[PDB]
Amino acid sequence: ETLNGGITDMLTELANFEKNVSQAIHKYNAYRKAASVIAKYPHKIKSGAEAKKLPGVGTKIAEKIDEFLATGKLRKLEKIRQDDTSSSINFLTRVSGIGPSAARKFVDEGIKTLEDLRKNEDKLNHHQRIGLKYFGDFEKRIPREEMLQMQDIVLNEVKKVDSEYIATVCGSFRRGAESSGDMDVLLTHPSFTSESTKQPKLLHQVVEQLQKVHFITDTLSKGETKFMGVCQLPSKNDEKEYPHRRIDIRLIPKDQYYCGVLYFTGSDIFNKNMRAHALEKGFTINEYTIRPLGVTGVAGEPLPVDSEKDIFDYIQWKYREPKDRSE
DNA sequence: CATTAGA
DNA sequence: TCTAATG
Ligand SMILES: [Mn+2]
Ligand SMILES: [Mn+2]
Ligand code: NA
Ligand code: NA
């Protein structure tokens, strides 16, 4: 957790690099498994040879480990950190819609900067355009103060469209969090479940509402169950307008909500931990359900849930407020 | 791990 | 269709 800190961090740097710059998935995957075990390793690593004793640690990494233990740095790391081309990819990548792939392509074409991106808006598709347009706004955290204003809007229309809708702004926002990356709203309706062969309008309607009143300003992607967009708080009596925010609305079969909702509420750790517990408690929990575990190894049979309570109940735990869904 | 774009 | 990108 810290006794192995640099080791891990250098390794992660290295790893990341294979994966983005080059396309060395394997090396790339090499580094993480390594980086993952050296972390669990309960003691301070004094040499490569020692690390080496680890699973995943080959001759390759040991070596790096030495140079790093030996001198406060790593050449290859030093070299990569420097290099303009690789530098450039880590950056273009910043744009929503840009990934390694395009980053490499763009680069090899001479697009290294935001400016270049502009001059060639044409080489970019709609998602990336939007990403470019809102670059600045995209990196800015979401003040809960705002988070609450937004939620208030969204719930407001939803209802207005159909009173039957059930919406839940999930995430850290849900989890108390002072700020948040983007708004995730879970959506479900009663006339929509497992079987009940869709109702795409169900997603569309609201999406339509939100736009009608200007909360939604752009669409990264709209399907029949997931909508990825851009929203924004009405710029008041002027002097102050609101940064453009990433928003994801998702449709759900009412018969999956809480799991869903459970799930997204996280925290990643609360999850797994909650998930690990369902196992002893003779179950299984995943994004959509919770099935009783049968001795024969595995088993099935979807337990019926009417709230996040039902689930705790099931696995017989303490109902944890979102607030304390921390770990 | 799964959904939407795209070309 | 594959293949990219975000979650
Ligand atoms: Mn989020
Ligand atoms: Mn999200
Ligand atoms: Na080994
Ligand atoms: Na990006």
Layout of secondary structure:
Layout: H1 5-20, H2 25-40, H3 48-51, H4 59-70, H5 75-82, H6 84-92, H7 100-107, H8 114-119, H9 126-133, H10 135-139, E1 142-143, H11 144-161, E2 166-169, E3 179-180, E4 183-189, H12 201-212, E5 216-222, E6 226-231, E7 245-253, H13 257-265, H14 268-280, E8 285-286, E9 289-290, H15 308-314
The protein binds manganese (II) ion (2 copies) and sodium ion (2 copies).
Residues 171, 180-182, 184 line the site of one manganese (II) ion.
It binds a DNA duplex (7 and 7 nucleotides) through helix 7, strand 5 and strand 7.
Binding site for Na(+) 2: 93, 95, 98
Region (DNA-binding): 175-184
Binding site for Mg(2+) 2: 182, 184, 248
H-E order: HHHHHHHHHHEHEEEHEEEHHEEH
N-to-C terminal Cα separation, in Å?
Answer: 16 Å
What is the CATH domain class of the largest domain?
Alpha Beta
Secondary structural class: alpha+beta
Number of separate structural domains: 4
Q: What bound compounds does this protein have? A: manganese (II) ion, sodium ion
Strand order of the largest sheet: 2-4-7-6-5
Total helical elements: 15
| Rg over C-alpha atoms, rounded to the nearest angstrom | 24 Å
CATH superfamily of the largest domain: Beta Polymerase, domain 2
CATH architecture heading of the largest domain: 2-Layer Sandwich
Biggest sheet, open or closed, and with what strands and sense?
A: 5 strands, mixed
* Share of β-strand residues: 5-15%
Keywords:
binds sodium ion, globular, DNA polymerase, domain 1, 9 strands, transferase/dna, alpha+beta, DNA-binding, five-stranded mixed beta sheet, DNA-directed DNA polymerase, 13% strand, Beta Polymerase, domain 2, 327 residues, DNA replication
